[PDB]
Design a protein around this ligand. Sequence first.
Ligand SMILES: *[C@@H]1O[C@H](CO)[C@@H](O[C@@H]2O[C@H](CO)[C@@H](O[C@@H]3O[C@H](CO)[C@@H](O)[C@H](O)[C@@H]3O)[C@H](O)[C@H]2NC(C)=O)[C@H](O)[C@H]1NC(C)=O
Ligand SMILES: *[C@@H]1O[C@H](CO)[C@@H](O[C@@H]2O[C@H](CO)[C@@H](O[C@@H]3O[C@H](CO)[C@@H](O)[C@H](O)[C@@H]3O)[C@H](O)[C@H]2NC(C)=O)[C@H](O)[C@H]1NC(C)=O
Ligand SMILES: *[C@@H]1O[C@H](CO)[C@@H](O[C@@H]2O[C@H](CO)[C@@H](O[C@@H]3O[C@H](CO)[C@@H](O)[C@H](O)[C@@H]3O)[C@H](O)[C@H]2NC(C)=O)[C@H](O)[C@H]1NC(C)=O
Ligand SMILES: *[C@@H]1O[C@H](CO)[C@@H](O[C@@H]2O[C@H](CO)[C@@H](O[C@@H]3O[C@H](CO)[C@@H](O)[C@H](O)[C@@H]3O)[C@H](O)[C@H]2NC(C)=O)[C@H](O)[C@H]1NC(C)=O
Lengths: 87, 48, 48
Amino acid sequence: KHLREFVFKNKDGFLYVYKGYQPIDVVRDLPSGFNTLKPIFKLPLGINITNFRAILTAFSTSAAAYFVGYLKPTTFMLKYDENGTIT
Amino acid sequence: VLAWNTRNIDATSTGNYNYKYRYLRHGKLRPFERDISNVPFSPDGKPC
Amino acid sequence: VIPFKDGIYFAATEKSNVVRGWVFGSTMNNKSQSVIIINNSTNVVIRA
Ligand SMILES: *[C@@H]1O[C@H](CO)[C@@H](O[C@@H]2O[C@H](CO)[C@@H](O[C@@H]3O[C@H](CO)[C@@H](O)[C@H](O)[C@@H]3O)[C@H](O)[C@H]2NC(C)=O)[C@H](O)[C@H]1NC(C)=O
Ligand SMILES: *[C@@H]1O[C@H](CO)[C@@H](O[C@@H]2O[C@H](CO)[C@@H](O[C@@H]3O[C@H](CO)[C@@H](O)[C@H](O)[C@@H]3O)[C@H](O)[C@H]2NC(C)=O)[C@H](O)[C@H]1NC(C)=O
Ligand SMILES: *[C@@H]1O[C@H](CO)[C@@H](O[C@@H]2O[C@H](CO)[C@@H](O[C@@H]3O[C@H](CO)[C@@H](O)[C@H](O)[C@@H]3O)[C@H](O)[C@H]2NC(C)=O)[C@H](O)[C@H]1NC(C)=O
Ligand SMILES: *[C@@H]1O[C@H](CO)[C@@H](O[C@@H]2O[C@H](CO)[C@@H](O[C@@H]3O[C@H](CO)[C@@H](O)[C@H](O)[C@@H]3O)[C@H](O)[C@H]2NC(C)=O)[C@H](O)[C@H]1NC(C)=O
C-alpha cells in the first residue's frame, strides 16, 4: 500500500535523516519515479557508524520487503518549479 | 576556545591521576568523534 | 548486518508496518556506543 523512503548520513558528528513516502501498487519490484525527500533529524551523536541492522516485526505472517542502496559524492542539477518544488 | 588554570582546584599534592588521554590508535579520529573504547592495543591489529 | 559505507539509502514496502526501526553503530555491541531509532507505534524514540 505504501512506500517509505529514508536517507541516512553521518557527518561532522551528526546523523542526518531525510524522509518521504508515496502510495504504491507493487508486490515484488521497486517502483520507479521521482520524489524529493525532506529533512527531519540532525542528531549530535558524535559516534562511529560502519554497520547497521533493520528492526523487523514478528508475526504468528504476511510478506514484506525492503531495499538498501549506497550514496556517492555525485554532482546533480536540480529543477525547481515556480512554487519552489523540485520536480 | 576558552580555558583556565585549575592548579588550586583539580591538581593535588600527591598528583591527581583522575584524568586520562589517548595516545594509541589504528588511525586518527574524525572531527567531533567521541572514541571512548578501551581495549588492549596491538601494533598490527591483532587481538592481545 | 549491512555496511553503512559513509551513507545509505533505505526504503521499504509496507501493508502491515513490518519494519519499525534501525540500529546504527560500528561493532554493533555493548563494547561501544550505538544508536537505536524506532517507531514503537506510539512514539518515535531515539537513544544512544
Ligand atoms: C569505527 O570502529 C571500527 C571498529 O571495527 C573501525 O573499523 C576498522 O577501521 C580500520 C581503518 O580503516 C580498518 O582497516 C584497518 O586498517 C589498519 C591500518 O594499519 C590495518 O592494519 C588493518 O588490517 C585494517 O586494514 C578495519 O578493518 C576496520 N575494522 C572493521 C571490522 O571494519 C572504523 O574505522 C571506525 N570508524 C571510524 C570513522 O574511525
Ligand atoms: C504551483 O503554482 C501553480 C500556479 O498555477 C498552481 O497551479 C494551480 O493551483 C491552484 C490551487 O490549488 C489550482 O486549483 C485552483 O483553485 C482556484 C481557487 O479558487 C480555483 O478557482 C481554480 O479553478 C482551481 O481550482 C489550479 O488548478 C492549479 N493550476 C493547475 C494548472 O494545476 C500549483 O498547484 C502550485 N503547486 C502547489 C503545490 O501548490
Ligand atoms: C555485553 O552483554 C553480554 C551479555 O551476554 C556480556 O557477555 C557476558 O559477560 C559476563 C561477564 O560479566 C559473562 O560471564 C558471566 O558472569 C556471570 C557472573 O556471576 C555468570 O553468572 C555467568 O554464568 C557468566 O559466567 C557472560 O558469559 C557473557 N555472556 C556471553 C554470551 O558472552 C558482555 O560482556 C557485555 N559487554 C560489555 C562490554 O559489557
Ligand atoms: C513506546 O514509547 C513510549 C514513549 O517512551 C513509551 O511510553 C512511555 O513509557 C514511560 C515508562 O514506561 C512512561 O512514563 C515516563 O517515565 C519517565 C521516567 O523518568 C518520566 O520521566 C516520564 O514523565 C513518564 O513518567 C511514559 O509516560 C510513556 N509515554 C507514553 C506516551 O506512553 C511506550 O511504553 C513504548 N512502548 C513500548 C512497548 O515500549
